[PDB]
Amino acid sequence: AALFQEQAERSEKLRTESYQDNLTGLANRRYFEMQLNARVSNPEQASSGYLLLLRVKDLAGLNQRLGGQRTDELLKAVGEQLSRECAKYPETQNLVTRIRGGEFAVLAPGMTREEALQLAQSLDSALSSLYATGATDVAAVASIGLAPFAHGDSPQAVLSLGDQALAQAEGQGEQNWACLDGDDHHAWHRLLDQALNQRRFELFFQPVVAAQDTQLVLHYKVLSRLLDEQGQTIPAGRFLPWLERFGWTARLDRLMLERVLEQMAGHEESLALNLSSATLADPQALNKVFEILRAHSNLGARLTLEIGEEQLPEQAVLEQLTRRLRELGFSLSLQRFGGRFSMIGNLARLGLAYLKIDGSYIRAIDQESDKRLFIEAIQRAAHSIDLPLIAERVETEGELSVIREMGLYGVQGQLFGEPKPWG
């Protein structure tokens, strides 16, 4: 659509102008902070992990002794070297940002300290190449601080740990890095291998309603809750990253799909359900899934699968996945969508039930222009292709009225019910 194509550049220009640091291409502090604030809040995204704070040694000195232009060039030079080291860790993806000239950060949710230690050294070792290069004249180049943050730690709290690490690193004339101070690594292992075998995850449901008619329910997202010794539940956030460090994620989709598939034959409502990259990465349990889908031909209409915008395979494959699905009469959509159209290309070609907007963009839309603006930009470019839009993490009576002003299709979030277990 010659139309779509204009509105999908106009929307991506508007991402970059808003959330992209122009120099390095990395996220701006604004975006970054929106993520931290928005992740801690979210039971399914939080929050064990690590924080990287890097400050470059002697900004001022560098500017005098080398002048602004060759200084700017330098931070480009590190943006890169940061990304390069942070590739190995996917969770970090999209979370590498530059706060202030000379200072950058990476949120690495669900990161092992040992991983952190290794990351710092590799990064530190890699960072020095710049000095030799002639890029900087300070040999130590930059200071590296890694703060470990527990989940349930407020973002402000999380940042504060980071400042200490950087400072700790700074007060060290031997090395340039540091990290503050499992567990337990094997307890999680055993607890999880176990619960999977024993089919011991519960099915939680969150309502998704029409934005126009709040009373009108489009579908219930099925979230996951791990059980523990006392049938207490544990939320996707805490445990998910542990499935990954262990490779058991596909195990879960497979389970959580057998359970949904049965339970749906208890009623007639419409559901929605995650589908990991790790089930798509593997071709063995991936295909399992279609077979499960094939047997239950009947419910394809009532079920809808959901990938994270980050977890996408190649548009080439995606086309394959979206199609092979439609054949089974089942629907597909995207979640944690953040306007990276350039990545999809073939979107209008896919035939998605909808896109669920990462909700990091929703919180305080009424009150925060740049967000409201960026989304208006998006609905417009997905209106054209009659691809419905759903907002996650709507909590406030206000945020809602702004979406009705925006004419999005639908809403999900604390405002319409936390996730619970109704059938």
Numbering used by the authors: 219 to 399, 407 to 648
Question: Anything the authors wrote about it?
Answer:
In order to elucidate the molecular mechanism that regulates LapD function, we determined the crystal structure of the intracellular module of P. fluorescens LapD, comprising a HAMP–GGDEF domain linker segment and the degenerate GGDEF–EAL domain module (LapDdual; residues 220–648). The structure of LapDdual (space group P32, one molecule in the asymmetric unit) was solved by single-wavelength anomalous dispersion phasing using selenomethione-substituted protein crystals. We also obtained a second crystal form involving different crystal packing contacts (space group I23, one molecule in the asymmetric unit), yet the overall structure of LapDdual in the two crystals is identical (root mean square deviation [rmsd] of 0.9 Å over all atoms; Figure S2A and S2C). In both cases, the biologically significant unit was predicted to be a monomer, based on energetic and geometric estimations. LapDdual adopts a compact, bilobal conformation. The GGDEF domain, comprising the N-terminal lobe, caps the dinucleotide-binding pocket of the EAL domain, which forms the C-terminal lobe of the tandem domain structure. The EAL domain buttresses the N-terminal S helix via predominantly hydrophobic interactions, burying 1,170 Å2. In addition to the S helix–EAL domain interaction, the GGDEF domain contacts the dinucleotide-binding surface of the EAL domain at multiple points, forming a loosely packed interface that buries 1,620 Å2 of surface area. One such contact, the salt bridge between an arginine residue (R450) and a glutamate residue (E262), forms a particularly close interaction. While E262 directly occupies the dinucleotide-binding site, the loop itself is located at its periphery, partially blocking access of c-di-GMP to the EAL domain. In summary, the structural analysis of the cytoplasmic domain of LapD reveals that in the absence of c-di-GMP, the protein resides in a conformation incompatible with dinucleotide binding, with the GGDEF domain restricting access of c-di-GMP to the EAL domain.
